[PDB]
């Protein structure tokens, strides 16, 4: 923009205009590869960990009925899912959210302050998603609370089976050693290989 004007050589008029604007509009590609990117992968992530806060506490909810089958974890549409394992993926989207609001406080310098300006929206999509994000890691939380205690019993169930396993393992190994070398019926070539 700072080019100057048109100017003309004295031999014959010259003009810039086509150049300038096609400058412009180059740099105008630069910023908007620049920008749709980051406004996706910002606003992305934080949708992702408010939805992630909500499904937690749905499944917290499930499992606080005693039951045996609810003693181990939950299945649902192909999905697997302990209480305890859960109790600690919540603070890791907790974590994730710091990381997150720092890239949204850079976001809210080209696009987030486009729509605080252009569009007046009060409140952000974003920020809007993490207010509704605090106020469902609070009920999570108080879920969360009354079914921390958890499977030892199916841990135990674990080392049961895997000594149970063993032992059979021990003893099938010994019988494949006996009939490891040939020492079986020997008749002929093909019949004491095969």
């Known amino acids: 923009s700072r080019i100057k004007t048109p100017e003309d050589i004295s ?5 810039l205009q086509p150049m300038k604007t096609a400058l412009d509009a180059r740099v105008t590609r ?16 934080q949708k992702n960990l408010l939805d992630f806060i ?5 499944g917290i909810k499930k499992n606080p009925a005693d039951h045996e089958n609810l003693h181990d974890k939950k299945l649902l549409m192909s999905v697997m899912k302990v209480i305890s394992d859960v ?12 990381r997150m609001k ?8 080209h696009n987030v302050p486009i729509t605080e300006k252009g569009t007046d929206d009060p409140l952000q999509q974003i ?15 108080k879920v ?18 895997l000594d149970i396993f063993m032992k059979e393992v021990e003893s099938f190994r010994k019988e494949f050693m ?17």
Do not use: C
Not at 36 to 45: C, E, G, I, K
Not at 102 to 109: I, P, Q, Y
Not at 127 to 135: L, M, Q, V
Not at 183 to 192: A, P, V
């Open 127 to 141: 920020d809007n998603a993490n207010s509704n994000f605090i106020e469902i890691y609070g009920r999570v939380f």
């Open 30 to 45: 630069w910023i908007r590869v620049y920008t749709d990117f980051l406004v996706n992968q910002f606003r992305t992530t």
């Open 102 to 109: 720092e890239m949204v406080t850079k976001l809210k310098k």
């Open 178 to 194: 006996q009939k490891l070398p040939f020492d079986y019926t020997e008749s002929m070539g093909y019949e004491n290989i095969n």
């Open 54 to 58: 909500e499904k937690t506490k749905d």
């Open 87 to 98: 109790k600690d993926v919540e603070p890791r989207r907790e974590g994730i959210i710091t």
């Open 11 to 15: 031999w014959l008029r010259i003009n």
């Open 144 to 161: 969360k609370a009354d079914i921390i205690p958890l499977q030892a019993e199916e841990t135990q169930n674990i080392k049961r089976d």
